[PDB]
């Protein structure tokens, strides 16, 4: 699809995420050309779940404790498509506020940003 | 233009930014679908300008100190265009880390994401 850019209506799509840790879930995600890497909420993961620590640069500076990194790939299915996007690794939000589809994943969909 | 998305290569543009408080300046700015408003480095404003308070939600949580809002509109010209994007107001980065062209500016270029 073509997704129009609007300050008052975020470009969000529904997305099935498979964390390999528990059954795949549907989330609502922001397509974000300014995210290096994909972000999915910790709530998608089982409690027995080992995650690596990591630095993320955000709007208000570098955060040490807010994001974690997966050890396993994460597969993401977009609406009406059978082939997953597979990310080697991705970011995890401990506060459960960000579900972000970043350029790692849009590269795989062959997504583009188009300026008339 | 069609910008391909790629995790190792930020999608950046050269933009002329007019604070109406010092001479216009051409800066490199991140093209960013995940931003509700544009962000401009405090360095581009006369150190003598009034700026309103505001709260922004970033990857590391809400911040109330880091971004101000502009008192005056901001004009932004992109490569090869006489006619400016006009922003009623926008965010100002107090630490000069970021120049981000956000959904406000991109609506006025009528940019779209496209997912094949």
């Amino acid at each position: 699809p073509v997704i129009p850019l609007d300050p008052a209506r975020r470009p969000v799509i529904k997305a099935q995420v498979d964390t390999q840790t528990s059954h795949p879930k549907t989330i609502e995600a922001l397509l974000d050309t300014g995210a290096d890497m994909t972000v999915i909420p910790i709530a998608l993961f089982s409690s027995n779940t080992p995650l690596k620590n990591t630095s993320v640069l955000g709007a208000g500076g570098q955060t040490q404790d807010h994001f974690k990194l997966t050890s396993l790939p994460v597969l993401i299915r977009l609406p009406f498509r059978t082939t997953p996007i597979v990310l080697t690794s991705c970011l995890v939000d401990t506060k459960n506020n960000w579900a972000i589809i970043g350029r790692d994943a849009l590269q795989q969909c062959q997504g583009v940003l188009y300026l008339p | 233009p069609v910008i391909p998305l790629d995790p190792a290569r930020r999608p950046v543009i050269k933009a002329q930014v007019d604070t109406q408080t010092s001479h216009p300046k051409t800066i490199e700015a991140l093209l960013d679908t995940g931003a509700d408003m544009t962000v401009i480095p405090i360095a581009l404003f006369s150190s003598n300008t009034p700026l309103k308070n505001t709260s922004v939600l970033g990857a590391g949580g809400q911040t109330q100190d880091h971004f101000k809002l502009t008192s005056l509109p901001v004009l932004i010209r992109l490569p090869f265009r006489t006619t400016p994007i006009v922003l009623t107001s926008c965010l100002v980065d107090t630490k000069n880390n970021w120049a981000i062209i956000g959904r406000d500016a991109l609506q006025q270029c009528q940019g779209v994401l496209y997912l094949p």
Binding site: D36, L91 | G58
Partner: peptide
């Protein structure tokens, strides 16, 4: 770090 970019209120 990787960068992740901005929301209102």
């Amino acid at each position: 770090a990787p960068q992740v970019x901005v929301m209102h209120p």
